[PDB]
Design a protein around this ligand. Structure first.
Ligand SMILES: [Cl-]
Ligand SMILES: [Cl-]
Lengths: 295, 300
């Protein structure tokens, strides 16, 4: 296993015709290598998994692996709200060369704890690739509590959990019920430094899409226990921790990216839409404040 | 008239999708459900919506169920196909696969999980509607989708010719009035929350796409007719008999409880259900069985 520190939930850049832009995707992979990002999640929420059918999903992940050329672990998204669909997505990724897979809890259909367990057990049963669980009730309508996560630790290849609740007290609870070995990632930038400080292993983040160097410093300092340096680094980027959510992720981050020249176009698949004029000002300020160089 | 009456209104069942022991669709139970609803007077059937477990049926199996439900109905009862998706392309695809099935309308939940803005919601439904000429019914259920599509956004779709109304499940009955004042008197309003169905009709809604319909269609029908007719006494008297089910069918996420009930009836042959959903846990068996007795259901 041993993915940790600053993990970027990568956006999927699109051509103005709406197809995947592989030139920008390559630029982004090099960028995270050039700065010091520890891993790349390909096609999760931030990467717009909802709007990418399986064949496109497989392509973006597979291409990201190719561009990385072994220099950085790539983790592929394998979440679905049907167990059978998740298994199929998992099987189609089994030989792309991912280090791991990130699987969100089934959204919309609100299964019970027993069902989440059976769900993830059957998904993990269909692969040798390490699985990371992902709880985000703000999006899924289901809260997968630590008591539930703990019953999955014994599944050989379930290696940890991303938790986006922002509820920092869960770190202790998760440590207590799972082992020291189970990996705990934060999925809430606003509480991340704190999450690591309480004993988290790393952060699967939106903001390190656009401030990876500083986001790395913050994560490394926190893990080392240099709280002063962690807070110091957090200080400069904290503004983005709310600005990148003035409309749902990845609407703002993708605008911020195509703005810094990171990507060729700001195109986004429907039902998602490009960031409203209303927020252009707010986000340019938070961006200039994080020492991001426009234009 | 003008000319043969009935638009889709009144008491509509969000139909259960019955399964065989091996998880395939049970067509003989499906046909039995369709007869049952005809005999008992249900106004219309939504096939493969949430209660029909739409998330765990791939598009092929989805359209077979819709196609067969229409067929079993054989012109005796309107069938509404679910066409909800969180990607526009996927919902266009699903809509197109249902054109020419003999469906009276389609019902499409707002995009879930990905949380589009209102401008995105409009673009989504415009594009879905543009790809068909079957009537479309919008579906708002923030409890499951994590977007709340507000009245003011629904109003901007009223102009889109074949969008005919909205199912609202929030249980905010103040929205009937708001929606009326912004949409037509002609725009169809459906309650999606059984606990507030009666009140929703009484305030000016046109119908209820209900979960409890599955197991108490006669009294439910009675309740909806009466409230539509403005006869509050009979409606309330109808409601009182079955009100207990409006809480008890939600002790686990729908359709887990209703499926158990329908089997324990049993309208179906098997209570099997598809992962990640699981059969009702035994903890709630007594809870639901007694709620069913109080609503006049038998055997047992
Ligand atoms: Cl998020
Ligand atoms: Cl529910």
């Amino acid at each position: 296993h041993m993915i940790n520190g600053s993990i970027v939930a990568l956006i999927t850049p699109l051509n103005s015709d709406g197809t995947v832009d592989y030139t920008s995707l390559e630029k982004l992979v090099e960028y995270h290598i050039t700065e010091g990002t520890d891993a790349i999640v390909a096609v999760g929420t931030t990467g717009e998994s909802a709007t990418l059918p399986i064949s496109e999903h497989i392509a973006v992940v597979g291409q990201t692996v190719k561009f990385a050329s072994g220099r950085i672990p790539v983790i592929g998204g394998n979440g679905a709200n049907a167990t059978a669909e998740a298994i199929e997505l998992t099987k189609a990724q089994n030989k792309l060369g991912v280090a791991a897979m990130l699987g969100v809890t089934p959204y919309y259909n609100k299964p019970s704890p027993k069902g989440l367990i059976a769900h993830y057990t059957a998904v993990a049963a269909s692969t040798d690739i390490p699985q990371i669980l992902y709880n985000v009730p703000g999006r899924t309508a289901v809260d997968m509590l630590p008591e539930t996560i703990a019953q999955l630790v014994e599944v050989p290849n379930i290696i940890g959990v991303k938790d986006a609740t922002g509820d920092v007290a869960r770190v202790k609870q998760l440590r207590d019920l799972c082992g020291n070995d189970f990996l705990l990632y934060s999925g809430d930038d606003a509480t991340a430094r704190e999450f690591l400080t309480l004993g988290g292993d790393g952060v699967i983040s939106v903001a390190n899409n656009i401030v990876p160097k500083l986001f790395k410093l913050m994560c490394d300092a926190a893990l080392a226990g240099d709280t002063q340096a962690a807070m110091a680094a957090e200080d400069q980027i904290k503004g983005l921790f709310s600005a990148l959510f003035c409309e749902a992720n990845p609407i703002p981050v993708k605008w911020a990216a195509h703005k810094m020249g990171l990507i060729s176009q700001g195109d986004i698949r429907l039902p998602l839409t490009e960031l409203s004029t209303e927020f252009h000002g707010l986000l340019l300020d938070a961006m200039k404040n994080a020492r991001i160089e426009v234009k």
